[PDB]
Amino acid sequence: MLDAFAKVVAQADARGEFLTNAQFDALSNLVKEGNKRLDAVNRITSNASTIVANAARALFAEQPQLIQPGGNAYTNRRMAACLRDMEIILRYVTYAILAGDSSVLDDRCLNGLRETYQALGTPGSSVAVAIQKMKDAAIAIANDPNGITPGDCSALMSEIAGYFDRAAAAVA
Amino acid sequence: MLDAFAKVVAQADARGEFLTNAQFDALSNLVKEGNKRLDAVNRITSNASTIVANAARALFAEQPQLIQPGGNAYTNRRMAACLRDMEIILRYVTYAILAGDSSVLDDRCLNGLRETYQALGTPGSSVAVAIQKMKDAAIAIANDPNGITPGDCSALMSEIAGYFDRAAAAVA
Amino acid sequence: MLDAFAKVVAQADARGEFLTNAQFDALSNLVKEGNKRLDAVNRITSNASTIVANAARALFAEQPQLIQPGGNAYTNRRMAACLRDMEIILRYVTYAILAGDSSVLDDRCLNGLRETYQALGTPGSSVAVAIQKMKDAAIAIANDPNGITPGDCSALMSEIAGYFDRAAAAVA
Amino acid sequence: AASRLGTSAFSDAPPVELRANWSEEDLETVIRAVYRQVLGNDYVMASERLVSAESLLRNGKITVREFVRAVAKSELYKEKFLYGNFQTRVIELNYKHLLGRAPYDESEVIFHLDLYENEGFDADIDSYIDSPEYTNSFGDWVVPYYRGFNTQPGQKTVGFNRIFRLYRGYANSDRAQAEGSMSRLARDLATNRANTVVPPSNSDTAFAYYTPSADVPPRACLGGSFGESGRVYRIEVAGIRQPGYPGVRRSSTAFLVPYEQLSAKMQQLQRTGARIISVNPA
Amino acid sequence: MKTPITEAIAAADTQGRFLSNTELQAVDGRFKRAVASMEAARALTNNAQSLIDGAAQAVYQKFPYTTTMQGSQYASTPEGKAKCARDIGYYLRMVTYCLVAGGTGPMDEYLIAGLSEINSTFDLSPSWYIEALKYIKANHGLTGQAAVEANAYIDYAINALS
Amino acid sequence: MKTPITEAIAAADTQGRFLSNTELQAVDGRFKRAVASMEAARALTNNAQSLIDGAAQAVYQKFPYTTTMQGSQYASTPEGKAKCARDIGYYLRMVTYCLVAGGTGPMDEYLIAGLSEINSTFDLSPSWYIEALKYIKANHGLTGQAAVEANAYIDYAINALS
Amino acid sequence: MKTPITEAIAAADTQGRFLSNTELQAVDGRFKRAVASMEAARALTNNAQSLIDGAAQAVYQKFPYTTTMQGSQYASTPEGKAKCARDIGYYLRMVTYCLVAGGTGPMDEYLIAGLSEINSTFDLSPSWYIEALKYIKANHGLTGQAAVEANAYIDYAINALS
Amino acid sequence: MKTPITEAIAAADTQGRFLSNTELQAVDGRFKRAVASMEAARALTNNAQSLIDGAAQAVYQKFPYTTTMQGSQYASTPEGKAKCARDIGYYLRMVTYCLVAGGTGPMDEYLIAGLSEINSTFDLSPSWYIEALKYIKANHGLTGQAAVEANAYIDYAINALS
Ligand SMILES: CCC1=C(C)/C(=C/C2=NC(=C\c3[nH]c(/C=C4\NC(=O)[C@H](C)[C@H]4CC)c(C)c3CCC(=O)O)/C(CCC(=O)O)=C2C)NC1=O
Ligand SMILES: CCC1=C(C)/C(=C/C2=NC(=C\c3[nH]c(/C=C4\NC(=O)[C@H](C)[C@H]4CC)c(C)c3CCC(=O)O)/C(CCC(=O)O)=C2C)NC1=O
Ligand SMILES: CCC1=C(C)/C(=C/C2=NC(=C\c3[nH]c(/C=C4\NC(=O)[C@H](C)[C@H]4CC)c(C)c3CCC(=O)O)/C(CCC(=O)O)=C2C)NC1=O
Ligand SMILES: CCC1=C(C)/C(=C/C2=NC(=C\c3[nH]c(/C=C4\NC(=O)[C@H](C)[C@H]4CC)c(C)c3CCC(=O)O)/C(CCC(=O)O)=C2C)NC1=O
Ligand SMILES: CCC1=C(C)/C(=C/C2=NC(=C\c3[nH]c(/C=C4\NC(=O)[C@H](C)[C@H]4CC)c(C)c3CCC(=O)O)/C(CCC(=O)O)=C2C)NC1=O
Ligand SMILES: CCC1=C(C)/C(=C/C2=NC(=C\c3[nH]c(/C=C4\NC(=O)[C@H](C)[C@H]4CC)c(C)c3CCC(=O)O)/C(CCC(=O)O)=C2C)NC1=O
Ligand SMILES: CCC1=C(C)/C(=C/C2=NC(=C\c3[nH]c(/C=C4\NC(=O)[C@H](C)[C@H]4CC)c(C)c3CCC(=O)O)/C(CCC(=O)O)=C2C)NC1=O
Ligand SMILES: CCC1=C(C)/C(=C/C2=NC(=C\c3[nH]c(/C=C4\NC(=O)[C@H](C)[C@H]4CC)c(C)c3CCC(=O)O)/C(CCC(=O)O)=C2C)NC1=O
Ligand SMILES: CCC1=C(C)/C(=C/C2=NC(=C\c3[nH]c(/C=C4\NC(=O)[C@H](C)[C@H]4CC)c(C)c3CCC(=O)O)/C(CCC(=O)O)=C2C)NC1=O
Ligand SMILES: CCC1=C(C)/C(=C/C2=NC(=C\c3[nH]c(/C=C4\NC(=O)[C@H](C)[C@H]4CC)c(C)c3CCC(=O)O)/C(CCC(=O)O)=C2C)NC1=O
Ligand SMILES: CCC1=C(C)/C(=C/C2=NC(=C\c3[nH]c(/C=C4\NC(=O)[C@H](C)[C@H]4CC)c(C)c3CCC(=O)O)/C(CCC(=O)O)=C2C)NC1=O
Ligand SMILES: CCC1=C(C)/C(=C/C2=NC(=C\c3[nH]c(/C=C4\NC(=O)[C@H](C)[C@H]4CC)c(C)c3CCC(=O)O)/C(CCC(=O)O)=C2C)NC1=O
């Protein structure tokens, strides 16, 4: 696992060159906007439960086949599993946001995740739709401009969207 | 672990003599009233959760020091532990009732429970009080005369009272 | 493991109520002197290896019977174990200094050490002497007035002495 | 009640299964933790570590279960425990190191001992490793931990007592303990006898209270005792040293005392210096 | 012992669950069969002397060599005859115990456990006991379901010997 | 408890290494946040009565059935009203403990651990406490980053109840 | 699932031995009781609609607040009434399944597994289903041992919710 | 690596919980210290060549025998002097990686692991590199808390080699 700082230093170690001035200033820029990153992750994690719950209700309303008898989100045990996996994806994406890199998202998630869903027979496309619902919810809550110091964090929001997109593409 | 029939067989095997006629008839008497035994265990096990919950409310009303802060049944995880270790005693007593002997109750539940509680600090008097609270509720629920073909059950009720009492004395 | 803040919280939880103004002031005093605490722990950790090595040489010069044939610091395996144990005591004392509370020092490291040495046969008094050598060395290293912004630090140095003393007394 | 009992913090589970099963750092931690649990917190020197097993461990060819078995059957483990102790004592140590518990009843010793007598020691370790308990509580990717403290699995109450006989502190190692070189839970296991919990030492005087019932009063009073109002409290003590007339005799012992006299007796005991282990109603 | 009631209790205990209706139904079946079981046990024990002495003579007839050949394993001496009688009595006693317990428990704990080892060390050829078991199966003097259950347990023993 | 300081100590202990710059940086961050954290804690503990009494009335308004329906789980009886006051006070006390501790440790060990079992056995629906916590999160009367810290811990409780 | 036949099979499989007479007796008892069990199942399914509707009204009467309070987890909307008619139907269906299976297997696999999680995520209260199950147990209209078995499964669900 | 950010992430991951304020506080401390850390890294890298050559001469002076005795593990040959320069350059490059990463991760994973094995097989006594690192720690020419942290990392390496 390599966060953003760790990632840049690891590639620089592979090349075997002292960190160059450009890399130094890139890292300084990362630190300068670090407070924003922390604020965004705090706000997302504070509403984690509501995000997952609302997204789940929406998914089962839009795709009733899942909760109909014989569907993969039936039997109340598989329903618990589905909620668990949605919140797991949210948890690892929040880890990724705090890190600044996608290394954690790919290691301990999405790696041999497509295959597991494919073998279980659970539709991966529906999983992607669920991830997208959570993406909209999280980006809205993470860009809410009320209750906080003013600023512009659109870059960080696009980064969050990128992480969610990566996951949804890997599972579907 | 010795059930009634096994107990008779074991004590006959130690002496090395074929089962005597007296022992035969004793076991036959146990079989004759076996349906009563099964009815009693069925009733108690059917209402286990309510039995434990009601007795717990009573215990904390009669001994408020448990709920009061700094005690042993405070902080909501120790509350969970207290409920767990009341229902555990109920479970092993039901095992005993079905068996017809106290062997299982004294071998796998009450065999040193006193010392464990001593080490933890859990007040040993209060657990006995809790078992008694459960005792009256369970005996009443098993002796409920409505819902089944009427008959005699006083002997069996005394027997289960004996099991509860044995545990309550051994834990104090 | 309890740190200073956690210690105050745990006492307050035992008594219920709500954090008193006095307790607030105590914690504020802890934080206003926190930079000192961190500096001290950094200095001790940076010279850990030399502290242990120098104290070991002194111990074996002062009490040669330990390293003479047939003594408990003989055969090059027990010598390795002795060096290990000295370093471990230093490590858990360093933990205690950073925490501000001696709970960690007595909860893992000193928890059972006495009987361990009693069974091994290792002279506990000699171990105490070694800990005291380390005490003087580390306190001198931390109290070195050159190399950092000057200021009052005597209270923290006395606290470091207190931790080392607790360990040395518990082993002997 | 954590510090006195000895369970400082055993409050999580260290798996190694990951996309980064090595995880570049976490594997170091897992290897250390396996060494601490399997070898009984023995101080393994660097030269004698089982390098061959760790090779396969990072490679992923072997799981944590295979790593634990490799250590358990390697001569590193055998020299410390297997060869040097009574066989029943070895069974106890296996239960402590591999399944994180203590023998719940005599049948456990019967079964494991018979395996050792016929099949060999390797098969005995095999039985512990692949027993349903190891397969469930741990998962071929989870280092064994002392789950005996927690009661969730389903166990005889005595188990709690018994595990505290084997674990005599965070610092302690089973190669080096007060009662070592002889069976610690053998006489009790045949009689299904409970054991008073001996707290490990913690920055105060320690007096390991052996409890051979060969010469002690019974757990119960078995009578009316003095007959004074109130029941009979059994008081234990270990370090009686001041009044040695022939030599005190039976320095560690218990006395059944009627309630009214307890206070007086207490001070007498404190005068000798023995720290009362327990005061249990009889 | 591994008695039906205790086996159900242990199965529930390993999962920490109250006794559900499955186990209760099982024990009910045990009680329903217990009437015939007790009848058969009483019949076997009241006629035990005939079934022990006759079985001894039956093995003496099927194996003449066991009552003549010199050696401790044989019953040529009167002391050996006493040993033979005691062992046949053990088998009959165990069958009665198993019948009363309603399950294989007693038989496995007090007989079958290590039976091969003991018969292979003290030179006690299992064929002797299996013939004796056959005799007691034939003169069991039991009818109806009482007969069938008893003979089943006897058959268990013979299959365990071989 | 899961206190930042203790978490760093445990991270160093599981690897066996002396406290590195990573752990020191972490605890320094905690000390730097502690000024605002202690301000927030003072605010909650000095205004406790308003917050708790108002929360009690808020839950009575949100769920009117809870102050009418007969039954021990409800606060229709005066004894139940006392219970409600005591428990809301416990929640606020734990949040103040967490604020001063600098982490979520105290509420993990003295609130959340086994909260599901209790809330199910005594029929105490978590939604009641969720709404009460919402009231406290709105009336705490904090500002700046102190408000952020207090709201973070309150929302931890809210999500744990859910 | 935990069907009597299959658990006997698993018990023999763990030991690695062919099915002994004890297991065969157990499954014979199962087959003997199956006639009554299936008659009771037919009776329960023939009046299923009336039972489900009556239970839905019973919970509406015990908890009027649930039919007025606005929100997703309430039956104040026609969609919520549909959800009630769905879930109560599921519980009755599972009871019939348990009756046919002669064990709690179906109940565990299709209902109890993760029930605790779901009732917290979707803000459902277990008490609702408990009251509905009580209505079902009182109006099942079965008699005899079959009635006993059905009530046992219903109470299993009741205690699982609690 | 053991980077403070990822250490907090791992601490939350092993307990399967969303990032609490504990981990957020830790990362905040890292960002606060990062200003000085990056200043220190820039300082060390900008004069890296000067410090490398100075350290090489320092080791040559402290251990003259290393420049004279014949053997593969000596710098008597120009190729040996080149390898010595390469090694001390590796140490300085790794310390400047560790400064930017924010913890002792880089030093631990890319060095300090099996260092004992290598130093024992090729017979490079650690004392040489220890003295070289001491020279670097005395001539780094930093000031303030930046100097403090750079020294701390260098001394971590020194104690690891010992
Ligand atoms: C414990 C972890 C942690 C958190 C959560 C945290 C919050 C935090 N946010 C801050 C600033 C800030 N936070 C924002 C955040 C935003 N601006 C926007 O327009 C958005 C809608 C939103 C981001 C999505 C901005 C713009 C600042 C001030 C400028 C800056 O720091 O970059 C600051 C610095 C000044 C201050 O407010 O005191 C802190 C300390 N600090 C922490 O140490
Ligand atoms: C199957 C047989 C069995 C029994 C009997 C049993 C008892 C038992 N109860 C325990 C804990 C406990 N038990 C209680 C119970 C109580 N608190 C109170 O206020 C009351 C007086 C009392 C209930 C009436 C508490 C509070 C603890 C936790 C103590 C602690 O962590 O400090 C523990 C310690 C380990 C654990 O937490 O599970 C055991 C072993 N465990 C078993 O497996
Ligand atoms: C699934 C396991 C199982 C159960 C539950 C079961 C119940 C059962 N209880 C019965 C009767 C009875 N039930 C009782 C019970 C009582 N008498 C009292 O005064 C008390 C209030 C109460 C104690 C619970 C009595 C006395 C009889 C008649 C005699 C008997 O069979 O026990 C009968 C026989 C007559 C009848 O059909 O009513 C059965 C079959 N049978 C079973 O195989
Ligand atoms: C990586 C996390 C981290 C650490 C470790 C840290 C330490 C730290 N402690 C400090 C303060 C201090 N440093 C001392 C040091 C001393 N004065 C003396 O006379 C003694 C010889 C000695 C005691 C060992 C004192 C007294 C202060 C307090 C005054 C202040 O805060 O500036 C300072 C500011 C001035 C200085 O460098 O001393 C820093 C940077 N800051 C951090 O962010
Ligand atoms: C059956 C006995 C046995 C063998 C053979 C074995 C091989 C083996 N060598 C390994 C590593 C390695 N082996 C090498 C070896 C080499 N690097 C080079 O430049 C050379 C060309 C070559 C030596 C001549 C390297 C570099 C690694 C490290 C891979 C890594 O961690 O990135 C690994 C990876 C996991 C680990 O390091 O434990 C395995 C499994 N393991 C075993 O238990
Ligand atoms: C160091 C190796 C070692 C020894 C020696 C040992 C002894 C030992 N012998 C046992 C049994 C036994 N040992 C005997 C021994 C004898 N009975 C007699 O009549 C004779 C006088 C004598 C043989 C000549 C008996 C009868 C039992 C069974 C006791 C019982 O089940 O109650 C048991 C009980 C548990 C079991 O049966 O599995 C142990 C622990 N255990 C060991 O690990
Ligand atoms: C993390 C807390 C902790 C501590 C402290 C601890 C102590 C500890 N020290 C040990 C050994 C030892 N301890 C010493 C200690 C000394 N000998 C001397 O001459 C000196 C006076 C002294 C050093 C100052 C020695 C020589 C051994 C090895 C004995 C042996 O294995 O034979 C052992 C067991 C034997 C072994 O090393 O395998 C333990 C368990 N264990 C722990 O888990
Ligand atoms: C008649 C049978 C009998 C025995 C066996 C006996 C043993 C015995 N020896 C004692 C003392 C002692 N025994 C020793 C013995 C030793 N010290 C050492 O350094 C050596 C390792 C070891 C001899 C080789 C010591 C030092 C004490 C005093 C302990 C103390 O005051 O702390 C004590 C403590 C009370 C006292 O001193 O009176 C007892 C009970 N007493 C008896 O009445
Ligand atoms: C309760 C379960 C149980 C069984 C089954 C059992 C068998 C048993 N039979 C034995 C001996 C014996 N058993 C016999 C039996 C026979 N001789 C014959 O001619 C017949 C064919 C046969 C009877 C059918 C004889 C003669 C001995 C003595 C053999 C000897 O001393 O070498 C012995 C040797 C110890 C002794 O001398 O008694 C055992 C252990 N012991 C048991 O505790
Ligand atoms: C320190 C951590 C901690 C918590 C959180 C805790 C909760 C807790 N609340 C309880 C009861 C209760 N809680 C309430 C609370 C309420 N009643 C209402 O009407 C409202 C809607 C609501 C307040 C908003 C009531 C009425 C009871 C008593 C229920 C009964 O007697 O059955 C009980 C049962 C024991 C008792 O009677 O007190 C526990 C264990 N206990 C703890 O130790
Ligand atoms: C096959 C087994 C099975 C069960 C048990 C089950 C329960 C279950 N009930 C649900 C919802 C629900 N359950 C109810 C039920 C009720 N509303 C009330 O007012 C009453 C008091 C109560 C009925 C008597 C309602 C209204 C919802 C919708 C809540 C929502 O969409 O947020 C949901 C969420 C998905 C949905 O909207 O359907 C599940 C998963 N699902 C299952 O697959
Ligand atoms: C990034 C981590 C890393 C380190 C630390 C490292 C060190 C390292 N230095 C080596 C050699 C060497 N290094 C030196 C260096 C020196 N000559 C002197 O006079 C001085 C005292 C000293 C410099 C301070 C010499 C002489 C050898 C050759 C030894 C031989 O071939 O026998 C070798 C053996 C293989 C080789 O020739 O490269 C290693 C592995 N390599 C690494 O990848």
Alpha-carbon gap, residue G160 to G156, rounded angstroms: 6
3-class DSSP state of A66: helix
Question: Residue H125: what are its φ and ψ, rounded to 5°?
Answer: -65, 135
Ligand 7 site-directed mutation target among C77, C111, C122, most atoms within 8 Å of CB = C122
- Residues F117, B53: C-beta atoms closer than 8 Å: no
Alpha-carbon gap, residue B75 to E146, rounded angstroms: 60
- Residues F148, A42: C-beta atoms closer than 8 Å: yes
Question: What is the sign of the dihedral through the CA atoms of H28, H29, H32 and H34?
Answer: negative
Residue with tokens 């109006």: G139
Alpha-carbon gap, residue H91 to H87, rounded angstroms: 6
According to DSSP, the residues that pair with D281 across neighbouring strands are D233
**Breaks (C–N over 2.5 Å) after residues, chain F:** none
Method: cryo-EM
From edge to edge, which strands make up the β-sheet containing D253-258? D253-258, D232-237, D279-281
Alpha-carbon gap, residue F20 to C146, rounded angstroms: 22
What is each CA distance from B13 to B24, D191, G96, in whole angstroms? 14, 20, 47
Alpha-carbon gap, residue D172 to D143, rounded angstroms: 19
Q: Which residue of A52, A57, A79 is in closest CB contact with G118? A: A79
- Which structure tokens are listed for A149? 């110091």
Burial tier of C144 (Cβ tally within 10 Å: 0-12, 13-18, 19+) = exposed
According to DSSP, the residues that pair with D258 across neighbouring strands are D232
Residue with tokens 């001390």: H88
Asked if F5 and F104 touch (Cβ cutoff 8 Å), the reply is no
Alpha-carbon gap, residue G21 to E107, rounded angstroms: 14
For the CA atoms of C5, C8, C9, C12, the dihedral, rounded to the nearest 10 degrees, stands at -170
Alpha-carbon gap, residue H88 to H132, rounded angstroms: 7
Question: Residue B120: what are its φ and ψ, rounded to 5°?
Answer: -65, -30
E83 CA → ligand 9 middle, Å: 6
What is each CA distance from G2 to A72, G8, G109, G150, G151, in whole angstroms? 22, 10, 9, 17, 18
Alpha-carbon gap, residue F49 to H115, rounded angstroms: 62
What is each CA distance from F133 to D80, F52, F128, F155, F157, in whole angstroms? 56, 10, 9, 8, 8
Return the CA Rg of chain F.
18
**Cα end-to-end span (Å), chain F:** 22
Alpha-carbon gap, residue A30 to B136, rounded angstroms: 68
Question: What is the sign of the dihedral through the CA atoms of C4, C10, C15 and C20?
Answer: positive
In this structure, what DSSP letter does residue E110 have?
I
Q: Concatenated DSSP letters for B102-133?
A: SHHHHHHTSSSHHHHHHHHT--HHHHHHHHHH
Asked if G123 and G69 touch (Cβ cutoff 8 Å), the reply is no
What is each CA distance from H50 to H100, H130, H149, in whole angstroms? 20, 18, 21
- Among A27, C4, F1, which Cα is nearest to H3's? A27
- Among A113, A110, A103, A112, which Cα is nearest to A1's? A103
- HEC sequence for G47-81: CHHHHHHHHHHHHHHHCHHHHCCCCCCCCCCHHHH
Number of neighbours of residue B93 by Cβ within 10 angstroms: 26
H57 CA → ligand 1 middle, Å: 49
Residues 6+ apart with CB under 8 A from F149: F33, F36, F37, F40, F99, H21
Question: What is the sign of the dihedral through the CA atoms of G13, G14, G18 and G23?
Answer: negative
Alpha helices in chain B (DSSP H): 4-15, 21-32, 34-46, 48-62, 77-99, 103-108, 113-120, 124-143, 154-171
The amino acid that residue F160 corresponds to is: A
Alpha-carbon gap, residue C105 to C97, rounded angstroms: 9
In this structure, what DSSP letter does residue F110 have?
I
| Side-chain half-sphere CA neighbours of F96 within 13 A | 31
Q: Domain holding G154: CATH number? A: 1.10.490.20
Residues 6+ apart with CB under 8 A from A67: A60, A73, A74, A79
Residues 6+ apart with CB under 8 A from E77: none
- Which structure tokens are listed for D280? 């249990």
Ligand 1 binding pocket (C-beta < 6 A) is A 33, 35-36, 38-40, 42, 142-143, 145, 148-153; F 145, 148; H 21, 24-25, 28
Burial tier of G146 (Cβ tally within 10 Å: 0-12, 13-18, 19+) = buried
The amino acid that residue B146 corresponds to is: N
Question: Residue G38: what are its φ and ψ, rounded to 5°?
Answer: -70, -35
- Which structure tokens are listed for D192? 């299904």
What is each CA distance from C101 to C1, C46, C98, H52, in whole angstroms? 9, 21, 8, 43
Alpha-carbon gap, residue E8 to E108, rounded angstroms: 17
Asked if B86 and D133 touch (Cβ cutoff 8 Å), the reply is no
- Which structure tokens are listed for A87? 């919140």
- Which structure tokens are listed for C50? 């030399």
Alpha-carbon gap, residue G78 to D47, rounded angstroms: 74
Asked if A133 and A55 touch (Cβ cutoff 8 Å), the reply is yes
Q: Which residue of D156, D158, D280 is in closest CB contact with B118? A: D280
The distance of E9 to chain G (nearest Cα, Å) reads: 14
Alpha helices in chain H (DSSP H): 4-14, 21-46, 48-62, 78-101, 105-110, 115-121, 126-139, 144-161
Alpha-carbon gap, residue B47 to B54, rounded angstroms: 11
Residues 6+ apart with CB under 8 A from A114: A124, A170, A171
Ligand 5 binding pocket (C-beta < 6 A) is D 52, 55-56, 58-59
When divided into structural domains, chain G yields a total of: 1
Collect all residues of chain D within an 8 Å Cβ-Cβ radius of residue A112.
19
- Which structure tokens are listed for F136? 């406290």
What is each CA distance from D216 to D250, F61, H96, in whole angstroms? 10, 65, 68
Alpha helices in chain E (DSSP H): 4-14, 21-46, 48-62, 78-101, 105-107, 115-121, 126-138, 144-161
Number of neighbours of residue C84 by Cβ within 10 angstroms: 13
Residue with tokens 């499954």: G27
- Which structure tokens are listed for A112? 């041999």
In angstroms, this model's resolution equals: 4.2
- Residues H2, F22: C-beta atoms closer than 8 Å: yes
A1-172 under CATH 3.40.1160.10, yes or no: no
β-bridge pairing D232-237 and D253-258: antiparallel
- Which structure tokens are listed for C161? 């002495």
3-class DSSP state of E158: helix
Alpha-carbon gap, residue A48 to H18, rounded angstroms: 8
Alpha helices in C21-69 (DSSP H): 21-32, 34-46, 48-62
- Which structure tokens are listed for A135? 């993406």
Asked if E136 and E92 touch (Cβ cutoff 8 Å), the reply is yes
* Cβ burial D231-261 (10 Å sphere, 16+ → b, else e): ebbbbbbbbbeeeeeeeeeebbbbebbbeeb
Question: What is the sign of the dihedral through the CA atoms of B106, B111, B115 and B118?
Answer: negative
Collect all residues of chain H within an 8 Å Cβ-Cβ radius of residue C50.
159, 162
Give, for D233, the enclosing helix (H) or strand (E): strand D232-237
Asked if B104 and B1 touch (Cβ cutoff 8 Å), the reply is yes
What is each CA distance from G39 to D104, F122, G35, G149, in whole angstroms? 46, 38, 6, 12
3-class DSSP state of D258: strand
Q: Which residue of C has its CA nearest to D181?
A: C119
3-class DSSP state of D173: strand
The amino acid that residue B87 corresponds to is: E
In this structure, what DSSP letter does residue D257 have?
E
Which chains pack against H, by 3+ Cβ pairs within 8 A? A, C, D, F
Q: Which residue of C has its CA nearest to D199?
A: C112
Asked if D273 and D241 touch (Cβ cutoff 8 Å), the reply is yes
G107 CA → ligand 2 middle, Å: 30
Number of neighbours of residue D264 by Cβ within 10 angstroms: 10
- Give H 94-153 residues with CB within 8 A of chain A: 96-97, 100-102, 105-106, 110
**Cα end-to-end span (Å), chain H:** 22
What is each CA distance from D101 to D91, D158, E17, in whole angstroms? 11, 11, 21
The amino acid that residue E107 corresponds to is: M
Collect all residues of chain D within an 8 Å Cβ-Cβ radius of residue B120.
1, 5
Alpha-carbon gap, residue E124 to D185, rounded angstroms: 38
Question: What is the sign of the dihedral through the CA atoms of E24, E28, E31 and E37?
Answer: negative
- Among E145, F82, C87, which Cα is nearest to B68's? F82
Residue with tokens 């320094």: F28
Q: Concatenated DSSP letters for chain G?
A: ---HHHHHHHHHHHHT----HHHHHHHHHHHHHHHHHHHHHHHHHHTHHHHHHHHHHHHHHH-GGGGTS-STTSTTSHHHHHHHHHHHHHHHHHHHHHHHHTSSHHHIIIIITTHHHHHHHTT--HHHHHHHHHHHHHH----HHHHHHHHHHHHHHHHHH-
Q: Concatenated DSSP letters for C108-152?
A: IISTTHHHHHHHHT--HHHHHHHHHHHHHHHHHHHH--SSS----
Residue with tokens 């504070």: A46
Burial tier of D105 (Cβ tally within 10 Å: 0-12, 13-18, 19+) = middle
Cα G106 versus chain centre, distance? 8
| Side-chain half-sphere CA neighbours of B106 within 13 A | 14
Closest residue CA from atom 32 of ligand 7: C78
The amino acid that residue D146 corresponds to is: Y
Structural domain of residue G44, as residue ranges?
Answer: 1-162
Helices G126-139, G144-161: inter-axial angle, 10-degree rounding: 170
B65: left (phi over 0), alpha (psi -120 to 50) or beta: alpha
Alpha-carbon gap, residue G66 to G60, rounded angstroms: 7
Residues 6+ apart with CB under 8 A from D215: D250, D253
Q: Where are the domains of chain B?
A: 1-172
3-class DSSP state of D254: strand
